[PDB]
Amino acid sequence: MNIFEMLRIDEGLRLKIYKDTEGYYTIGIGHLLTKSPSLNAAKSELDKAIGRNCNGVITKDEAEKLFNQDVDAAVRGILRNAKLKPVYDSLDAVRRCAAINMVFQMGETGVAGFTNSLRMLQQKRWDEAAVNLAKSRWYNQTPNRAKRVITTFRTGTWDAYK
Ligand SMILES: [Cl-]
């Protein structure tokens, strides 16, 4: 297991524009296109991201390339954020994957607001962090995915994904 396999499981793969769990236009392996309700706006974002006129459809190679860029952007967002970087650097490799997963799903600013969870993670209070992470809109709106991510923080293993 690695971060790419973990997020591929959590996000799936769809080659045509779809709506994510929040109702936002998305493509590929969970690549958000826009929060605008305009499908044309989503199609313009797609063409810009891919570099060609796609008509709302991409290839699997294109989906995987977008996915690699998106994972890297999540990592670089963590490393440039004064609240997230110290927690990230305190974690082992498996738990770092759980952190990237959260930033991929909710964005750097969203995860940076989990101030008390982040402190408990940095203190390595895993069960306490797990309880605190579940007290969130995130857990309530996507409970199966949040439970997998939280189990990864709690145990430091890939057991939720096996
Ligand atoms: Cl879910």
Side-chain angles (χ1 to χ4, degrees):
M1 287 287 300
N2 59 56
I3 182 58
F4 296 95
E5 297 183 5
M6 184 200 204
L7 277 165
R8 171 59 180 83
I9 288 165
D10 283 335
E11 299 291 342
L13 172 63
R14 303 181 72 174
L15 301 183
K16 314 191 177 306
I17 294 178
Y18 65 98
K19 287 178 175 184
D20 75 3
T21 182
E22 302 284 349
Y24 297 138
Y25 288 122
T26 303
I27 200 162
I29 306 164
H31 181 82
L32 175 62
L33 292 163
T34 182
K35 295 188 188 180
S36 165
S38 168
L39 180 55
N40 283 339
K43 286 173 173 183
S44 176
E45 291 298 305
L46 181 59
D47 293 355
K48 176 166 55 83
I50 304 297
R52 64 176 181 89
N53 285 329
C54 299
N55 196 27
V57 180
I58 59 177
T59 68
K60 184 181 183 184
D61 280 357
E62 288 168 344
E64 291 176 335
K65 185 170 183 173
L66 272 180
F67 180 46
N68 195 334
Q69 296 178 350
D70 290 343
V71 172
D72 293 339
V75 173
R76 299 307 289 274
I78 291 166
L79 297 177
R80 67 183 180 85
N81 184 287
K83 293 194 62 192
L84 299 176
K85 182 178 197 294
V87 185
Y88 187 79
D89 285 344
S90 79
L91 298 170
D92 58 276
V94 176
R95 296 188 170 90
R96 291 193 305 259
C97 288
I100 298 161
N101 193 306
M102 290 189 72
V103 169
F104 189 101
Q105 184 180 358
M106 299 181 305
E108 176 194 336
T109 305
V111 179
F114 277 66
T115 306
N116 302 320
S117 302
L118 290 170
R119 182 183 306 112
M120 291 176 201
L121 291 169
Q122 185 158 350
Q123 296 169 327
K124 305 195 173 298
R125 299 175 172 206
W126 306 126
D127 284 13
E128 295 84 358
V131 170
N132 186 264
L133 282 160
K135 296 171 184 176
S136 60
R137 181 181 185 275
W138 170 58
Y139 176 94
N140 284 102
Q141 300 302 131
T142 56
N144 283 336
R145 198 247 188 83
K147 282 168 186 185
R148 290 195 291 277
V149 173
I150 290 170
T151 292
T152 309
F153 279 128
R154 185 175 56 82
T155 69
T157 78
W158 290 114
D159 283 4
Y161 291 83
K162 298 294 186 178

